[PDB]
Amino acid sequence: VESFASMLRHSPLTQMGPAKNKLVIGQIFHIVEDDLYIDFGGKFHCVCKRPEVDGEKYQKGTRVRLRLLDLELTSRFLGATTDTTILEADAVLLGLQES
Amino acid sequence: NDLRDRILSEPLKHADFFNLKELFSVRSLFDARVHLGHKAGCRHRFMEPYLFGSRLGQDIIDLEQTAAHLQLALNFTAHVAYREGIILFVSRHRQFAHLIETTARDCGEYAHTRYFKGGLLTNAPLLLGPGVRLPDLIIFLHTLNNVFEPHVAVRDAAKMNIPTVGIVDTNCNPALITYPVPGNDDSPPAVRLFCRLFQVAISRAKEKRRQVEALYRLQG
Amino acid sequence: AGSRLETVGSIFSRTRDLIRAGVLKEKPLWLDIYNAFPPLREPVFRRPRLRYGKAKAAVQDIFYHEDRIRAKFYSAYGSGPKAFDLFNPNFKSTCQRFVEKYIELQRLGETDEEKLFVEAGKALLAEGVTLRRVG
Amino acid sequence: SNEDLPVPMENPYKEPLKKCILCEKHVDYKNVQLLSQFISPFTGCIYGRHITGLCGKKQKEITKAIKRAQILGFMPVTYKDPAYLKDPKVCNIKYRE
Amino acid sequence: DDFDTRILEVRNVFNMTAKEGRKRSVRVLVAVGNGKGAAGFAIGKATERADAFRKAKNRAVHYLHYIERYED
RNA sequence: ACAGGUUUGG
Ligand SMILES: [Mg+2]
Ligand SMILES: [Mg+2]
Ligand SMILES: [Zn+2]
Numbered sequence: 001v002e003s004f005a006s007m008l009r010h011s012p013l014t015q016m017g018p019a020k021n022k023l024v025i026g027q028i029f030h031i032v033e034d035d036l037y038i039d040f041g042g043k044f045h046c047v048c049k050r051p052e053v054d055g056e057k058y059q060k061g062t063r064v065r066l067r068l069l070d071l072e073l074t075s076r077f078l079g080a081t082t083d084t085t086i087l088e089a090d091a092v093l094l095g096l097q098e099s
Numbered sequence: 100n101d102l103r104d105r106i107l108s109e110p111l112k113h114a115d116f117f118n119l120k121e122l123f124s125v126r127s128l129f130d131a132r133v134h135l136g137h138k139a140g141c142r143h144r145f146m147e148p149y150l151f152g153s154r155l156g157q158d159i160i161d162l163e164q165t166a167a168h169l170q171l172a173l174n175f176t177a178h179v180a181y182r183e184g185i186i187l188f189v190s191r192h193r194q195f196a197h198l199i200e201t202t203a204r205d206c207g208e209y210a211h212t213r214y215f216k217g218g219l220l221t222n223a224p225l226l227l228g229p230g231v232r233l234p235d236l237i238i239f240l241h242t243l244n245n246v247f248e249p250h251v252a253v254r255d256a257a258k259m260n261i262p263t264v265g266i267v268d269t270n271c272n273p274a275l276i277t278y279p280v281p282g283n284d285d286s287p288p289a290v291r292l293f294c295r296l297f298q299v300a301i302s303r304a305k306e307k308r309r310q311v312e313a314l315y316r317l318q319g
Numbered sequence: 320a321g322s323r324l325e326t327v328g329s330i331f332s333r334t335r336d337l338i339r340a341g342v343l344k345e346k347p348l349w350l351d352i353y354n355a356f357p358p359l360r361e362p363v364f365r366r367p368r369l370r371y372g373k374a375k376a377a378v379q380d381i382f383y384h385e386d387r388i389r390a391k392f393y394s395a396y397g398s399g400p401k402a403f404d405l406f407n408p409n410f411k412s413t414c415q416r417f418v419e420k421y422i423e424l425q426r427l428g429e430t431d432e433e434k435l436f437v438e439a440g441k442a443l444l445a446e447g448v449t450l451r452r453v454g
Numbered sequence: 455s456n457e458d459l460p461v462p463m464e465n466p467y468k469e470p471l472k473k474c475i476l477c478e479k480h481v482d483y484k485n486v487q488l489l490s491q492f493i494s495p496f497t498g499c500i501y502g503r504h505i506t507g508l509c510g511k512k513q514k515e516i517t518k519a520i521k522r523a524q525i526l527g528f529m530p531v532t533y534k535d536p537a538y539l540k541d542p543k544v545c546n547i548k549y550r551e
Numbered sequence: 552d553d554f555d556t557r558i559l560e561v562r563n564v565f566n567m568t569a570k571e572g573r574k575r576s577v578r579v580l581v582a583v584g585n586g587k588g589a590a591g592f593a594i595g596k597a598t599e600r601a602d603a604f605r606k607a608k609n610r611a612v613h614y615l616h617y618i619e620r621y622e623d
Numbered sequence: 624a625c626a627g628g629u630u631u632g633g
Contacts, residue, residue, distance in 0.1 A: 004151070004162035007129050009383060009458040015415045016403055017389050018155055018467045023402035029287070041405030043135050043157070043285065065402060071157060074138045081369065082270065083140035085247075087285070111355045130408060142376070144367050152381035152460055155467070159381055171358055178352045221323075235349060257362070258323045260330045262349050274365045277330065278358050322591075323613045336617035340589035381460040390466035567632045574632095 013042060019071040025097065027063045038091065040066055046091035057096060065098065066091040102318060106311055110181055117177045117303050120170065122296055125162050128169070132286040134160045136269030146269050149281040158269050160281050172264045172278040173300050176236065179262075180208075180304035184235035187211060188297075189252040192241035195290050199240060202294040206301040209234065211252070215244070220255040239265030239276065240293060241284045249275075266293060329362040388418045391436060397453045413448060474509035475544065481512060483519040486529045490538040492516060492545065498533050505547050556583045556608055564596070581607035583615075588623075591615040 008014065016022055019042075026040035036058060039045045046066065050058060058064070073086035110116040128134070136142075136150070136158040151161035180186060186208035190199050196212040203210035216226065223231050237256045242265050244250050249272050256263045257275045265276040266284045273279035283289045321343070322333040331353055337343045338350075370376070392414045399413030420439040429435050440450060482488070492501050500520060503513055523529040560580040565573050577600050584590030591614040595607025 002126065003456070004125055004129070004134070005456045006458045007126060007162075008134065008151075008159065008381075009385075011129075012403055012405055012407070012410050012412065013135075014154065014381075014383070014385075015389070015412050017386060017393060017414075021398060023398050023400075025402050025404050027406075039287070041132075043132065043283075072138055074140055076140060082143075083138065085137060085141055085270075107351075111351060114356075139378075142378070144370065144376075145365070147377045150378050152379055154381040155465075158378065168359065171356060174356055175352055175358075178355075179349060182348050182352070184348060235347075254325065257325055257330055257364070260321050260334050260347070262330065262353070263362075272367065274367075275325075275362055277353075277362045320612045322615050324616070327616065337589060337615065340585075340587050340617055342585070342589050342615065379460070379462065380465075382463045382465065383458075383460060384463075387463070387466045393467065562633095565632050572632085 019068050022068045023094075024066050024068050024091075025063055026066050026091075028058065028060060031058075031060050036093075038064060038066060038093075040068060040089070040091060042068075042071060042089070044072055044087065044089040046089040048091065048093045051093060054096070062096060064096040065094045067094055102315065106315060107182060109311070110178060115174070117174075117181075117300070117307060119173045119177060119300060119303075122173070122299055123166070123169065123292075125166050128162055128166060128282075128292070131288040131292040133165065133282045133289050133292070134162050135283050135286070136160055141270045143270050143272060145272060145274055146267075146281065149267075149273070150269065160269070160283070165281055168278065168280045169282075169296075172280050173296060175262070175278050176238070176264055176297060177300045177304040179236045180301045181308050183308070185209065185232065186236045186238060186301070187234035188238045188240060189215070189250065190238075190240035191215060191244040191250060192284070193245065195240075195287070195294075198290065198294060202298055206298055207305070208301060215251050217251070220252065220259055220261075233259060233261065235261070237261055237263045238297065239263060239267075240290060242267050242271035242273075242276075326364045326366075328364070331357075331361070332363070385418050385422075388421050389414050392417050395436075395452060396450050400449050400451065413450075416446070416448070417443065472509075474507070474512050476508060476512040476516070479512070481515050481519055483522045483526070484528060486523060486535060487538045487541060489516065489520050489523055489529055490534050491541050491543075493520065493534050495534045495539060496549075498531055501545050501547065505545050507546065553585045554583050554612070555585065556581055556611065558604070558607075559592075561600075577603045579603050579607055581611050583608070583611040588618050588620050589615055590618065 024040045026038040026046070028036055028038050029045070030037040034050050036048045036050060037045045038048055048066075068089070068091050070090040073088060073090055074083040076083050134151070138156045139153050139158055140156075142150070142158055146158075149160065149164065151159045153159065176186070186206075187210070188199055188203050188208065189211045191212060191214075199212050200210045218226050220233060223233060237252055239250065239253060242250060242253060247270070253263060253265065253275055255261075262277045263275070264278040265271075265273070265280070266282050267273040267276065267279045268282070268284050273281075282293070322337060324333065327333065331350075334343065334347065334350060338346060401413050403412055404410045417439055420442055421435055424435055424438055429438075443450065492506055493499065494501070500517060506513070508516065520529070524531045529535060558579055558581055562578055564576045564578045566576060568574050576596060576598055578594060578596035580592065580594055581604070582590065582592040591611055593607050593611035593614055595603045595605075595610060597603035597606055
């Protein structure tokens with residue numbers, strides 16, 4: 001039986017290490033008038049803006065490329081015992097499954 | 100009445116009376132992003148014994164104890180559904196409110212994902228009706244509401260002597276939940292996995308209750 | 320009726336003693352289930368006092384020896400060309416193949432860090448991956 | 455008995471600390487061209503940390519050198535020497551919008 | 552029926568409103584207990600004394616403790 | 624001391 005300690009070491013998130021400028025692939029799951037909720041797959045979903053190039057080619061279920069900046073935007077302020085989580089992620093659009 | 104007590108005493112003598120171990124595994128929980136939590140700064144103090152570590156700020160949950168608590172929670176959930184217990188899925192989160200309500204509809208149990216009213220469970224004889232039947236079990240799929248504060252039902256259940264089975268993230272307070280399960284309630288795959296687990300745990304319990312009643316009808 | 324107290328203890332500790340006293344003359348259906356399969360921790364109310372002083376949390380950071388090797392690749396070449404796919408459970412990345420080649424060459428008795436580092440990059444050209452050294 | 459447990463080691467991805475513009479440099483009180491890049495060209499006010507961006511050591515030594523050069527007769531006080539106006543802009547303040 | 556209650560405190564509480572000025576309100580502490588170890592207390596506050604007593608008696612049943620008594 | 628009364632719109 002494979003326990004948790006062995007299956008965690010072979011996780012792609014462990015192989016990626018820090019989330020600073022990592023190239024990842026994410027599949028869109030919801031569409032807004034101009035915003036795109038792309039789930040790169042780690043914990044949260046990043047909100048990106050529809051570019052002017054091939055903006056119509058972005059539909060529900062499309063896989064796109066991202067450069068992950070931060071995994072979960074959390075920070076502290078004055079008089080806050082905990083942090084203020086944004087419940088999102090930070091990522092930018094580069095391409096849409098160039099293959 | 101002498102034959103009806105046997106129906107209730109039958110499942111109490113066996114450990115896995117409904118065979119709930121095959122419904123999931125450590126790998127099935129790992130594949131649903133359950134082992135992932137918030138950053139170290141958002142860590143609640145009562146999650147240090149329920150955390151496995153911290154991978155560059157982000158904490159990791161121990162899936163062994165996760166699966167053990169999940170086994171216990173699913174057993175307690177199946178027994179309530181077998182004993183004809185009112186199960187209420189209370190979860191205030193504007194991302195899967197539709198999925199939770201659909202799961203409750205398919206299970207035949209009740210749901211609550213809208214604005215939780217103040218005197219709902221306490222002042223029930225004035226909010227619901229003259230004399231009502233309170234939910235025998237409360238299931239939490241999101242302990243924290245949109246204000247990042249503990250829900251009201253998680254305290255009202257303990258105030259009205261009602262058992263609670265809740266998914267607690269790294270920023271939730273499991274001090275009052277009867278059967279807590281340290282996991283992730285922010286991932287769509289995680290919430291789908293929990294919804295399906297409770298779905299099958301309710302379905303098998305109800306079907307086995309019906310089979311036991313059918314057998315009781317032929318007992319005499 | 321019941322006991323609406325929160326800070327005293329657990330719902331089991333507030334219902335079993337009441338039934339023992341004999342006020343609640345009807346036993347709740349969940350009480351037998353609780354007695355059959357109690358949880359690991361009794362649900363007693365605990366107030367989360369803030370941690371002051373030199374005290375620190377009991378959680379321990381997650382770091383492996385493979386991270387010390389992945390740091391070299393991320394400082395030398397940066398992010399790999401093959402983007403990560405978080406949906407594939409058995410997805411192997413460029414840095415993962417590099418650290419695998421490193422730990423494989425380590426068994427050959429090679430103790431020089433340069434010998435263990437440059438030989439993996441030279442061997443990856445046999446598989447045919449493209450590396451972009453950040454200078 | 456498990457061999458895949460995390461080991462209590464340091465952080466390998468620990469990034470180097472940010473350096474000031476004069477980190478590991480030698481400031482002086484006679485390089486008027488150097489000290490003028492931190493004073494306002496219209497008035498001569500000494501820019502602070504929020505504008506310059508110097509770490510705790512050089513920030514005070516720059517001010518001391520400026521105050522020494524303003525009394526010894528190396529650099530004017532009421533303004534900046536116009537011969538050193540063509541120096542590259544180091545500060546982070548924009549006047550003309 | 553086996554429960555027995557006792558009044559522990561009675562006090563005439565006043566409040567300064569905008570129009571009526573002094574607003575005399577009766578607040579009382581009422582304890583309940585049967586004699587087998589189960590007991591509790593509550594506070595009933597109202598305008599009339601008979602109404603405050605009734606509210607305290609009705610709210611004292613909801614808060615019950617159990618006192619472990621060695622040899623009773 | 625088994626204690627109670629006495630300040631104040633409270
Ligand atoms: Mg959460
Ligand atoms: Mg006074
Ligand atoms: Zn410096």
